[PDB]
Amino acid sequence: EGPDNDERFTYDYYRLRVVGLIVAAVLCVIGIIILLAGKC
Amino acid sequence: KEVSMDDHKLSLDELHNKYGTDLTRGLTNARAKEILARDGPNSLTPPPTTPEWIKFCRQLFGGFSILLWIGAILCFLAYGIQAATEDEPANDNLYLGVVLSTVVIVTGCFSYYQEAKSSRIMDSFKNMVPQQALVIRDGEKSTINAEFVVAGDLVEVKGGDRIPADLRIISAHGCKVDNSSLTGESEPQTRSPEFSSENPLETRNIAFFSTNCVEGTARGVVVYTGDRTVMGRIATLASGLEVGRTPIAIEIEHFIHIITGVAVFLGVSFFILSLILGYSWLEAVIFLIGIIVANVPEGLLATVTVCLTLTAKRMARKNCLVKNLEAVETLGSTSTICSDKTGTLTQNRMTVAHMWFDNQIHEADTTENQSGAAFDKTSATWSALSRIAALCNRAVFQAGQDNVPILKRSVAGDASESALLKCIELCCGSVQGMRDRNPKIVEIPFNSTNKYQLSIHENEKSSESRYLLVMKGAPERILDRCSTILLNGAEEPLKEDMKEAFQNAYLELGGLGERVLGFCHFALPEDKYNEGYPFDADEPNFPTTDLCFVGLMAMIDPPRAAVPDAVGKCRSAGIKVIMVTGDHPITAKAIAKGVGIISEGNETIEDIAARLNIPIGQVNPRDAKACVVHGSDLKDLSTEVLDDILHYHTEIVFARTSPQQKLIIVEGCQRQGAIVAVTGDGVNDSPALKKADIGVAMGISGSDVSKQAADMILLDDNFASIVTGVEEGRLIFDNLKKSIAYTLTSNIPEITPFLVFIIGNVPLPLGTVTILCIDLGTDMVPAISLAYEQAESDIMKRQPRNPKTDKLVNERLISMAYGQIGMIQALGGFFSYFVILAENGFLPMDLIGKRVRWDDRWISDVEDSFGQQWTYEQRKIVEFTCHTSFFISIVVVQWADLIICKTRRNSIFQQGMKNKILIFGLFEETALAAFLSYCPGTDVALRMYPLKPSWWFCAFPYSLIIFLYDEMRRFIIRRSPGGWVEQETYY
Amino acid sequence: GWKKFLWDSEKKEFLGRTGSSWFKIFLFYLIFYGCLAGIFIGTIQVLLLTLSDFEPKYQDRVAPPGLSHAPYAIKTEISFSISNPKSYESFVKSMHKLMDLYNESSQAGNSPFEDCSDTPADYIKRGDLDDSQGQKKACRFSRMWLKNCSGLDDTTYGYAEGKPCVVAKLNRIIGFYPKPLKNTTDLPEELQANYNQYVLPLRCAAKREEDREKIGSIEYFGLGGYAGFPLQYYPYYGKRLQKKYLQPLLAIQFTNLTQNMELRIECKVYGENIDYSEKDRFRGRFEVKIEVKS
Ligand SMILES: *[C@@H]1O[C@H](CO[C@@H]2O[C@@H](C)[C@@H](O)[C@@H](O)[C@@H]2O)[C@@H](O[C@@H]2O[C@H](CO)[C@@H](O[C@@H]3O[C@H](CO[C@H]4O[C@H](CO)[C@@H](O)[C@H](O)[C@@H]4O)[C@@H](O)[C@H](O[C@H]4O[C@H](CO)[C@@H](O)[C@H](O)[C@@H]4O)[C@@H]3O)[C@H](O)[C@H]2NC(C)=O)[C@H](O)[C@H]1NC(C)=O
Ligand SMILES: *[C@@H]1O[C@H](CO[C@@H]2O[C@@H](C)[C@@H](O)[C@@H](O)[C@@H]2O)[C@@H](O[C@@H]2O[C@H](CO)[C@@H](O[C@@H]3O[C@H](CO)[C@@H](O)[C@H](O[C@H]4O[C@H](CO)[C@@H](O)[C@H](O)[C@@H]4O)[C@@H]3O)[C@H](O)[C@H]2NC(C)=O)[C@H](O)[C@H]1NC(C)=O
Ligand SMILES: CCCCCCCC/C=C\CCCCCCCC(=O)OC[C@H](COP(=O)(O)OCC[N+](C)(C)C)OC(=O)CCCCCCC/C=C\CCCCCCCC
Ligand SMILES: CCCCCCCC/C=C\CCCCCCCC(=O)OC[C@H](COP(=O)(O)OCC[N+](C)(C)C)OC(=O)CCCCCCC/C=C\CCCCCCCC
Ligand SMILES: CCCCCCCC/C=C\CCCCCCCC(=O)OC[C@H](COP(=O)(O)OCC[N+](C)(C)C)OC(=O)CCCCCCC/C=C\CCCCCCCC
Ligand SMILES: CCCCCCCC/C=C\CCCCCCCC(=O)OC[C@H](COP(=O)(O)OCC[N+](C)(C)C)OC(=O)CCCCCCC/C=C\CCCCCCCC
Ligand SMILES: CCCCCCCC/C=C\CCCCCCCC(=O)OC[C@H](COP(=O)(O)OCC[N+](C)(C)C)OC(=O)CCCCCCC/C=C\CCCCCCCC
Numbered sequence A: 001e002g003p004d005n006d007e008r009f010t011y012d013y014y015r016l017r018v019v020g021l022i023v024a025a026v027l028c029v030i031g032i033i034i035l036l037a038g039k040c
Numbered sequence B: 001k002e003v004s005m006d007d008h009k010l011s012l013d014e015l016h017n018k019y020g021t022d023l024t025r026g027l028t029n030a031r032a033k034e035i036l037a038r039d040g041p042n043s044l045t046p047p048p049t050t051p052e053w054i055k056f057c058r059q060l061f062g063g064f065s066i067l068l069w070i071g072a073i074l075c076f077l078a079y080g081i082q083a084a085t086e087d088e089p090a091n092d093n094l095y096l097g098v099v100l101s102t103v104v105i106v107t108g109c110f111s112y113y114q115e116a117k118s119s120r121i122m123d124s125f126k127n128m129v130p131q132q133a134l135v136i137r138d139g140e141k142s143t144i145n146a147e148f149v150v151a152g153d154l155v156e157v158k159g160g161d162r163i164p165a166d167l168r169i170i171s172a173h174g175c176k177v178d179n180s181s182l183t184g185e186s187e188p189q190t191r192s193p194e195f196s197s198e199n200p201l202e203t204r205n206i207a208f209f210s211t212n213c214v215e216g217t218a219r220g221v222v223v224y225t226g227d228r229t230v231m232g233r234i235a236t237l238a239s240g241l242e243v244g245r246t247p248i249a250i251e252i253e254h255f256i257h258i259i260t261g262v263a264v265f266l267g268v269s270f271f272i273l274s275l276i277l278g279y280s281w282l283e284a285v286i287f288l289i290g291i292i293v294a295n296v297p298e299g300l301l302a303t304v305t306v307c308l309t310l311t312a313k314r315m316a317r318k319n320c321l322v323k324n325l326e327a328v329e330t331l332g333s334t335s336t337i338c339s340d341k342t343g344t345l346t347q348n349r350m351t352v353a354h355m356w357f358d359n360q361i362h363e364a365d366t367t368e369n370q371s372g373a374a375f376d377k378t379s380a381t382w383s384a385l386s387r388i389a390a391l392c393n394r395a396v397f398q399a400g401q402d403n404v405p406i407l408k409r410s411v412a413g414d415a416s417e418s419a420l421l422k423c424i425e426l427c428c429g430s431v432q433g434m435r436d437r438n439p440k441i442v443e444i445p446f447n448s449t450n451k452y453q454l455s456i457h458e459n460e461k462s463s464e465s466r467y468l469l470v471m472k473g474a475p476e477r478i479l480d481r482c483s484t485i486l487l488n489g490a491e492e493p494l495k496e497d498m499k500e501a502f503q504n505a506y507l508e509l510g511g512l513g514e515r516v517l518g519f520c521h522f523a524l525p526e527d528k529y530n531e532g533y534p535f536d537a538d539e540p541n542f543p544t545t546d547l548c549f550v551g552l553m554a555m556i557d558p559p560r561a562a563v564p565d566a567v568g569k570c571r572s573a574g575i576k577v578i579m580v581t582g583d584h585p586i587t588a589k590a591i592a593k594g595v596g597i598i599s600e601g602n603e604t605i606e607d608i609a610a611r612l613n614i615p616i617g618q619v620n621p622r623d624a625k626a627c628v629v630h631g632s633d634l635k636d637l638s639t640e641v642l643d644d645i646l647h648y649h650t651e652i653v654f655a656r657t658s659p660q661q662k663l664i665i666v667e668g669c670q671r672q673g674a675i676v677a678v679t680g681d682g683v684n685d686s687p688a689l690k691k692a693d694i695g696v697a698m699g700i701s702g703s704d705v706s707k708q709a710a711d712m713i714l715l716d717d718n719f720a721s722i723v724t725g726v727e728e729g730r731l732i733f734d735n736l737k738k739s740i741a742y743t744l745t746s747n748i749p750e751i752t753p754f755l756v757f758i759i760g761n762v763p764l765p766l767g768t769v770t771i772l773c774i775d776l777g778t779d780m781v782p783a784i785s786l787a788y789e790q791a792e793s794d795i796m797k798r799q800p801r802n803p804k805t806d807k808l809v810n811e812r813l814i815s816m817a818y819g820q821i822g823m824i825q826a827l828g829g830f831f832s833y834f835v836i837l838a839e840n841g842f843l844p845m846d847l848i849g850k851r852v853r854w855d856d857r858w859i860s861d862v863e864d865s866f867g868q869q870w871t872y873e874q875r876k877i878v879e880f881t882c883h884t885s886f887f888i889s890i891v892v893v894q895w896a897d898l899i900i901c902k903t904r905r906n907s908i909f910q911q912g913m914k915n916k917i918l919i920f921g922l923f924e925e926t927a928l929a930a931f932l933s934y935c936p937g938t939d940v941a942l943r944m945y946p947l948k949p950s951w952w953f954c955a956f957p958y959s960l961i962i963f964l965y966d967e968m969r970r971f972i973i974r975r976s977p978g979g980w981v982e983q984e985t986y987y
Numbered sequence C: 001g002w003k004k005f006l007w008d009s010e011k012k013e014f015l016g017r018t019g020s021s022w023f024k025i026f027l028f029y030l031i032f033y034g035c036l037a038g039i040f041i042g043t044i045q046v047l048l049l050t051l052s053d054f055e056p057k058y059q060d061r062v063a064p065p066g067l068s069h070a071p072y073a074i075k076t077e078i079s080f081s082i083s084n085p086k087s088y089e090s091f092v093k094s095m096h097k098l099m100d101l102y103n104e105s106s107q108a109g110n111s112p113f114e115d116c117s118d119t120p121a122d123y124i125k126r127g128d129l130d131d132s133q134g135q136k137k138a139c140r141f142s143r144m145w146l147k148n149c150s151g152l153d154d155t156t157y158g159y160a161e162g163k164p165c166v167v168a169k170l171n172r173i174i175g176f177y178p179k180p181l182k183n184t185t186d187l188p189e190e191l192q193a194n195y196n197q198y199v200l201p202l203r204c205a206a207k208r209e210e211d212r213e214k215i216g217s218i219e220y221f222g223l224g225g226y227a228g229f230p231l232q233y234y235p236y237y238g239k240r241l242q243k244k245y246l247q248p249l250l251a252i253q254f255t256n257l258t259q260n261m262e263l264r265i266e267c268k269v270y271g272e273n274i275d276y277s278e279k280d281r282f283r284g285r286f287e288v289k290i291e292v293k294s
C-alpha cells in the first residue's frame, strides 16, 4: 500500500499497558473497599 | 513416693500457728492479696513454646515445597553450567530459578498465617469459663478463680468438686476422694481430720491436687500451691498432651495419597517421553514440576483446619463450647438425643400453683396482690398444712430482700422449697417466727433411701402432746405412710374412699403437668414421749407410720421458650429425642406431650388400652409408636427387651429412671447403630457421658467431674442450643465438599494442554510458570472463601449422614468435577489459544505437526498459513502470548465455577451474593491476571506478554455456558427428588 | 471386594452398576460431548470467517526481518575435515535442498516468472492485495548468478578444499519494502563504496578484534555482482497471491581461512526498517562458527 506503510507493522503497546494498569488498579481498589466494608 | 514431706502430723493449734489463718474465719482478703503477689498464682508454669522462626522455617521446608526447592536448585545449577560455555547466554534459567523460590516463599508465609490463626483461636477456649474454688474469707464463703487460691486459705470442697491444691483436712463429714490419678486405684478413699498414717499417700487428712471429691464435704487448708503441689510435679513434666488429628483430616490425607501416586507416575512417564523426543535435561524436570503442581491439591489440609477452626468460633458464639475438635465433626452426625426433663427442657424455677386439703381442690397464690387466696385463710386444716410447709422446709431467704415482694426476691435452697417459702409468706405470714416457735430438734434431709424429708419440732402451745413430727415427700408414698386425715379441724381415719378421692386429685393435678408433693404431720403422745425425751436420729425411736396426712401441694414449672421449636427441628432433622427423668410418669407423659416429644396422634400401649377399655396386657405393644418406660421396669429388662423398645418405638420417654441407668440406655441406643448425645450434670452421669458419642455437660450447674468427663459443654443448659449447634455442625461438611469440588475442577484445563501437546503434536498452549501462578499464585484465597459460606434452607431438612455409606470424596464428585465442568474449562482455554495463533498468521489446519519444527531453535525459516517466514524468538513470542491468554481464560471460567460451587441444592438467586470474602476473591484474581499480563519486565522475567483487548472476551461464552448449565441441573434436582440427576450428579 | 466388586450375580452388576445404569450414563455422556463438540466447532468457524485469506491481521511480531542461512548448522557451527568426505555431507545435503528450488526447469514460460532487469532496480507494484487480477507475477532468479557456489560446477560448493560458501537469505514478509541507508555523511565505513541505492547491503566481519587477522577474503556473490539484495524482488504478496515466488539470495565465500581454529563470523544487513535485537541473534544479523580442521 505504498512505501510509507510503516503503520501496518506498528502497535501502540505503551497505551495498552497504561490502560491495563489503570484497570488493574481500579479492580484492586474496589476489592479492598468491599472487603473492609463492615469493619468501619 | 520420693518427694514427700507433709504437715499432717501438726495439730489444729500447730497448723494455725504455722500457716497463720483463722480456722473458723479463714484468711482476710488483704492477706490473700499479699500471699498471691508473693507466692504467685495457683497455676502450673506453662511449657515453653516453639519459636516463631522455627515454625515459619518448617513451612519453607515442608508440604511439597521440597519439590519446588529441588527444581529451583536445578535451574540455578543449569544456569551456572551455561556461564562456563559460550558468552552472552540467555538468563532464562536464572529467572526460572528466581520464580520457583518465590513461589515457595509465598506458600510458606500463607500456610504459616493460617496455622497460627487456628492455634490462637483454640487458645481462646482456655480462659472463657475457668475452673473455680470455694474459699472461706472473713467468715464469708465466696467463689473465686482457682489461680487466686493462696497457701493457708481455708478451702471447702463438696461432692463433685476438684481439689484446687494440696490441703490439710480440718473438718469433714463422710468425704470420699478419688486418688485414681495419684495412686491408680479408682476406689474412693475416705478423708477425715484424724491422723491415720505417717505417710502422705495413706493419711486420711490430706487432699491432693488434681483429685476430685466423689461424695461428702470437707474443709482444708492449702499446704502447697501451684507447682509446689505433689501432683503438680508429675503433671507439669510428666503429663503433656501429644498432637492429635481427626477422621475428616485423615479421609482427606488418604485421598491426597491416591492422587499423589497417580500424579507422580504420570510425571516420570512424561519425563522419559521428553527425553525420547529430544528435549533438554532441565526442561524434563520443568515438565515434571508442572504436571505435579497441576495435579496435586496441596491446599486441602489447610482448608480443613481452617473450616473446623472457623466453625468452632461460630459455635462458641452460639453457646456450644466443644472441649475437643473431634466433637465439632461428631455433632453433625447426631442421630439420637437423650435429654433430661429438669434443668435442660425446663428452667428450674418452680412456683406453687394449687393445693388439695379438706378433700377439695383449692386455688391460691394471688398474682402479686393482697387478695390472699381463693379459700378461707381461717381453715383449720390449712393451718396444719402451712405449718408443715414452713417447718419442714430447709430453704431460708437471704439478707437485703426486705425491699421487694416475695414473687421477685431470691432464696437459698431447692426450687421446690423456695416455691413453698414464697407461697407461705404471701398467704400465711412470716416463716422466721414460725420456725422460731417450733424449734427443730433434729432433721433428716431428703435421702434416696428414705425418699421423704423429716423434721422434729417442739410445740410451745398448750393442749398438744409437746411433740410435733412433720414430713413431706412423694404423695403416693406419704399416703401409704398415714392412717388418718385432718378435715376441717376434725381428724378422721383414712378409709379407701378418701384414698380414691385423693388419687382422683393426684390424677387431676398431675395430668396438668404439675409436680405434686405430699405433706403430713403427727402429734406424738406425751405419755410415750415426755418433754425431756431425746429423739435419736441415728436409731429411729419415734414411729414412722400411722401419721396424719394433711394435704397435697403442687407447683408449676414452664418449659423453655426455644424448646418446642427445637424438638420440631429434630423431628424434621430425623433425630430422636428421649426424656430421662426422676419424676412420675403422669407428669413426664404430660410435659413430654406439651414440649413436643409426644406429638398429637401418637399413643402408648396404656393410652390405647384406656381408649378401648381393655387391659393393657391385652393390647399389642407394636400398636403404640411412643412409650413411657418405668425405672423399675428398665432395671428388670434384659438387653433384648431394651433393643425391642428402642427399635420399635419412635418416641421413648424413660420416667422414674435413675441417672445411673443412663448408661444402659446409651448402650442400647448404640447397639442400634446410632450416634447418641447425652446430657449430664452430676457425678453418676459420668459413665454415660463417657460412653455416649457426644457428652453434653451442663455449664451452669455441672460439677468439675462431669465437665471433665464430657466433650461438649452447654453454656445455657438449654436444649435449643444443642439443635443450633448441630445445625452449625452440618455446615462444616457442606462447605468442605464445596471446596473439594472447586479446587479439583481446574485439573482438567491445566493438564489437558500437555496431553494435547504430545498426542496432537501442536505447540504448547499453557506453560509451567503460568500453572504455578494459577494453583499456587491466585486460587489460594478463593479456595478458602468456600468455608465462609452460609447454609442452605435444607440443612435441617435432610437426614443424618452415616460414616459407613457417606464419604467426602465419592464417585459422583469426580463425575461433576472432571467429566462435565472440567472439559468445559479446557475448551475455553483452547479456544483462546486457537484465536491468538490464527490472528497472528498461523491457521488451525497448518498447526498439526509443526511442533518438531517449532521447538527446533535452528529453523529460522518456519512458514505459516499465509506463507510468511518466522524466526525463533518471533514465533516463541506468539506462543507465550498464548500461555498468558490460556491463564486469563482460566480465571474467567473460574468465575463461573466458583459462583456455581457456592450452593449445591439451591440456586444462587435464592441464596444470594452475601459472602464478602468470595466476592473479594473474584475481583482480586481478575486484578492479578491483568497485572501479570500488563506490567513491564514480565516479558523477560515471567515470560508473560501483554494481551490485546479483543482477546480477554474469548472465554466469555464458556463461562456463561458453565453457569447456565449448573443452574438447570440444580433445578431438576429440587423438582424431582430421588431422580437420575440426583443419583448420578449430587456430590 | 477384590472379586465381589468385579462381578456379583445377585444384583446382576458389572464393575458396580447394572445394565440400565451404564446405558443411561453412556447415553448422557455421548449427547453431552456432542453438544460440546458442536459449540467449539461453531465458535471456531466464526473465527475462520473473521480473518482474511490474502493478509494476516497482525504483522507486528515479524519486523524487522530476520536473516537465515544454508547450511543448517546446529549451534551455529560449521566444522568439517577436508579429508574425510562423510564430514560435510549433512551440510551439502542442505545447501542442495535450498538451491534445488531455483532450477531453471522450474522457472519457465511467461508465467508466473517474468524476466526482470539483470542489474539491480527499484520496487515493482503488481497492484493491491486482491484477487481481481489473478495470480501475480514474480521475477526470475537464476542459479548461475551465484558464481562459485551453485552446485552446478563443484557440487560440493567449496567444502572439498577448504573454501566454504554460505548462502544468506532475507526472511519473506508480506508487503515489506526494504529501505537502504542514504548517502549522507553518516553511514558505516564499509557501505560507502558501491552505493547502489537499489541494493540492500550485507557485510560480514569478525565478532572479536583479534579474529580479524585470522579471517581471510570474504568474497560476496550476488545479483549484479553486488553484496546485497535487489529491491526489485519486493514486495512479497504472500503465498495465496504469488505462488511460485523466489526470494533473492547472496552467496558468501570465506576464502583464505586459517586452519585448525574456531572462527566467529558475524554477518549483518543494513537499512532503515532493519533493527537488531540483543535477545534474538537472528534479527537482521547472524552468527556462524567455522572451523575447517584438516
Ligand atoms: C535440479 O537440478 C539438479 C541437477 O541437475 C543437473 O544439472 C542441471 C544443470 C541439468 O543439466 C540437469 O539436467 C542435471 O540433471 C537435479 O539433481 C540431479 O538429478 C539426477 C537424477 O537423479 C542425479 O543423477 C544421478 O547421479 C547419481 C550419483 O550422484 C552423485 O553425485 C551427487 C552430486 O551431484 C551426489 O549427491 C550423489 O550422492 C552421488 O555422489 C547416479 O548414481 C544416478 O544414476 C542414475 O542414472 C543412471 C544413468 O545416468 C542409471 O544408470 C542409474 O540406474 C540411476 O538411475 C544419476 O545419474 C544428479 O546427481 C542430481 N544432481 C545433484 C547435484 O544432486 C535436481 O533433481 C533438480 N531438481 C528439480 C526440482 O528440478
Ligand atoms: C554517494 O556519495 C559519494 C560521496 O559523496 C560526497 O560526500 C558526500 C558525503 C556528500 O558531501 C557529497 O556531496 C560528496 O560529493 C559519491 O562519490 C564521490 O564522488 C566524487 C566525485 O567524483 C569524488 O570526488 C573525487 O575525488 C577525487 C580524489 O579522491 C578527485 O580526484 C576527483 O576529481 C574529479 O572532480 C574534479 C572536480 O572536483 C574534476 O576536476 C576531475 O576531473 C574529476 O572529475 C573527485 O573530486 C569522491 O571521491 C566520491 N566519494 C567516494 C567515497 O568515492 C558517490 O558518487 C555517491 N553515489 C551516488 C549514487 O550518488
Ligand atoms: C492499595 C492499592 C494502591 C493502588 C494505588 C495505585 C496508584 C497509581 C500508581 C500507578 C497507576 C498506573 C501507572 C501508569 C504507569 C505505568 C508505567 C508504564 O506504562 O510503563 C510502560 C513502559 C514499558 O516500555 P514499553 O512499553 O515501551 O516496552 C516495549 C513493549 N514491547 C516489548 C511490547 C514492545 O515503561 C517503561 O519503559 C518504564 C517503566 C518504569 C517503571 C514503571 C513501574 C511499573 C511497575 C509497577 C507500577 C504499577 C503498580 C500498580 C499497582 C496495582 C496493584 C496490584
Ligand atoms: C500473589 C502471587 C501470584 C503471582 C506471584 C508471582 C511470583 C513472582 C515473584 C517475583 C518475580 C519478579 C519479576 C521481577 C520484575 C522484573 C525485574 C527485572 O529483572 O527487570 C529487568 C528489566 C530489564 O529489561 P531489559 O533491559 O532487557 O529491557 C529491554 C527493553 N527494550 C530493549 C525493548 C528497550 O527491567 C526493566 O525493564 C525495568 C522495569 C522494572 C519493573 C518494575 C515492576 C516492579 C515489579 C514487582 C513489584 C510489584 C509488586 C506488587 C505490589 C502490589 C501492591 C498492592
Ligand atoms: C492398553 C491399555 C489401554 C487402557 C485403556 C483404559 C482407558 C480408561 C478410560 C477412562 C478411565 C476412567 C477413570 C475414572 C475412574 C473413576 C474411579 C472412581 O469413580 O472411583 C470412585 C471411588 C469410590 O467412590 P464411591 O464411594 O462413590 O464408590 C461407590 C461404589 N458403589 C456405589 C458401586 C458401591 O473413590 C476413590 O477410589 C477415591 C478417589 C479416587 C480419585 C481418582 C481420581 C483420579 C485422579 C487423577 C487421574 C486424573 C487423570 C485425568 C486424565 C485422564 C486422561 C484423559
Ligand atoms: C484430551 C482431552 C482434550 C480436551 C479438549 C481438546 C481440544 C482439542 C481441540 C482441537 C485440537 C485438534 C487440532 C484441530 C486441527 C484440525 C484441523 C481441522 O479439523 O481442519 C478441518 C476444518 C477446517 O476447514 P476449512 O474451513 O479450513 O476448510 C476449507 C475447505 N474449502 C475451502 C476447500 C472449502 O476444521 C474444522 O472444520 C473445525 C475443526 C477445529 C477443531 C475441531 C477438533 C475436533 C472437533 C471437536 C473437538 C472437541 C471434542 C470435545 C470432546 C469432549 C471430550 C474430550
Ligand atoms: C457478556 C456475557 C458475559 C457472561 C459472563 C458470565 C460471568 C458469570 C455469570 C454469572 C455470575 C454472576 C451472577 C450474579 C448473581 C446475582 C444474584 C442476585 O443478585 O441475587 C439477589 C440477592 C438475593 O437477595 P435476598 O435479600 O432476596 O436474599 C435472601 C437470602 N436469604 C433467603 C438467605 C436470606 O441479593 C443479594 O445477594 C444482595 C446483593 C448482592 C449484589 C451482588 C453484586 C455483585 C455480583 C458479582 C460481582 C462481580 C464479580 C466479578 C469481578 C470481575 C469484575 C471486573
Ligand SMILES: CCCCCCCC/C=C\CCCCCCCC(=O)OC[C@H](COP(=O)(O)OCC[N+](C)(C)C)OC(=O)CCCCCCC/C=C\CCCCCCCC
Residues within 6 Å of the ligand: B907, B909, B910, B964, B967, B968, B971, B974, B975
Ligand atoms: C440469550 C442469551 C442471553 C440471555 C440472558 C438472560 C439474562 C437473564 C437475567 C436474569 C434471570 C432472571 C432472574 C431469575 C430470578 C428468579 C427468582 C426466583 O424466584 O428463582 C427461584 C427459582 C428456583 O425456585 P425453586 O427451585 O425453589 O422452585 C421449586 C419448585 N418446586 C417446589 C415445585 C420444586 O430460580 C430459578 O428458576 C433460577 C433458574 C434460572 C436459570 C437461568 C439462568 C439465566 C442465565 C444468566 C443470568 C444472567 C446472570 C449473568 C449476567 C451476565 C451479564 C453480562
Ligand SMILES: CCCCCCCC/C=C\CCCCCCCC(=O)OC[C@H](COP(=O)(O)OCC[N+](C)(C)C)OC(=O)CCCCCCC/C=C\CCCCCCCC
Residues within 6 Å of the ligand: B824, B827, B958, B961, B964, B965, B968, B969, B972, B978, B979, B980, B981, C024, C027, C028, C031, C032, C035, C036, C039, C040
Ligand atoms: C460449551 C459448553 C456447552 C455445554 C452444553 C451442554 C448441553 C447439554 C445438556 C443436557 C444434555 C444431556 C441430556 C441427556 C438425556 C439422556 C439422559 C437419560 O437417559 O435420562 C434418563 C432419565 C429418566 O429416567 P428416570 O429417572 O425416570 O428413571 C429412574 C431410574 N431408576 C429406576 C434408577 C430410579 O432422565 C431424567 O431423569 C431427565 C433428566 C434429563 C437431564 C436434564 C439435564 C439438562 C441439563 C442442561 C441443559 C441446559 C443447556 C443450557 C445450555 C445453554 C447454552 C447457551
Ligand SMILES: *[C@@H]1O[C@H](CO)[C@@H](O[C@@H]2O[C@H](CO)[C@@H](O)[C@H](O)[C@H]2NC(C)=O)[C@H](O)[C@H]1NC(C)=O
Residues within 6 Å of the ligand: C216, C217, C256
Ligand atoms: C592468505 O593468507 C596467507 C597466510 O596464511 C597469506 O600468505 C602469507 O603471506 C606472508 C607475507 O605477508 C608470508 O610470509 C607467508 O609465507 C604467506 N603464507 C602463505 C601460505 O602463502 C596470503 O597473502 C593470504 N592471501 C589473501 C588473498 O588473503
Ligand SMILES: CC(C)CCC[C@@H](C)[C@H]1CC[C@H]2[C@@H]3CC=C4C[C@@H](O)CC[C@]4(C)[C@H]3CC[C@]12C
Residues within 6 Å of the ligand: A015, A016, A017, A019, A020, A023, A024, B926, B930, B948, B949, B952, B953
Ligand atoms: C461481573 C462481570 C460481568 C464483570 C466482567 C468484567 C470484564 C468484562 C472486565 C474485567 C477486566 C477487564 C479488562 C481489563 C483490562 C483491559 C485492557 C484495556 O487496554 C482494554 C480493556 C480491558 C481488556 C478490560 C475489558 C473488560 C474486562 C475483561
Ligand SMILES: CC(C)CCC[C@@H](C)[C@H]1CC[C@H]2[C@@H]3CC=C4C[C@@H](O)CC[C@]4(C)[C@H]3CC[C@]12C
Residues within 6 Å of the ligand: B811, B814, B815, B818, B819, C025, C029
Ligand atoms: C480424550 C478422550 C478420548 C477421553 C474421554 C474420557 C471419558 C470417556 C472419561 C473421562 C471421565 C470418565 C468418567 C469419570 C467418572 C465416572 C463415574 C463412574 O461411576 C462411572 C464412569 C464415569 C462416568 C467415567 C466414564 C468415562 C469418562 C467420561
Ligand SMILES: CC(C)CCC[C@@H](C)[C@H]1CC[C@H]2[C@@H]3CC=C4C[C@@H](O)CC[C@]4(C)[C@H]3CC[C@]12C
Residues within 6 Å of the ligand: C034, C035, C038, C039, C041, C042, C045
Ligand atoms: C446447540 C448445539 C447442539 C448446536 C451444534 C450445531 C453444530 C452441529 C453446527 C454449529 C456450526 C456448524 C458448522 C458451521 C460451518 C460449517 C462449514 C461447512 O463448510 C461444513 C459444515 C460446518 C462444519 C457446520 C457443521 C455443523 C455445526 C458444527
Ligand SMILES: [Mg+2]
Residues within 6 Å of the ligand: B689, B690, B691, B692, B695, B711
Ligand atoms: Mg468421650
Ligand SMILES: [Mg+2]
Residues within 6 Å of the ligand: B743, B745, B746, B747, B750, B774, B775, B779
Ligand atoms: Mg487448580
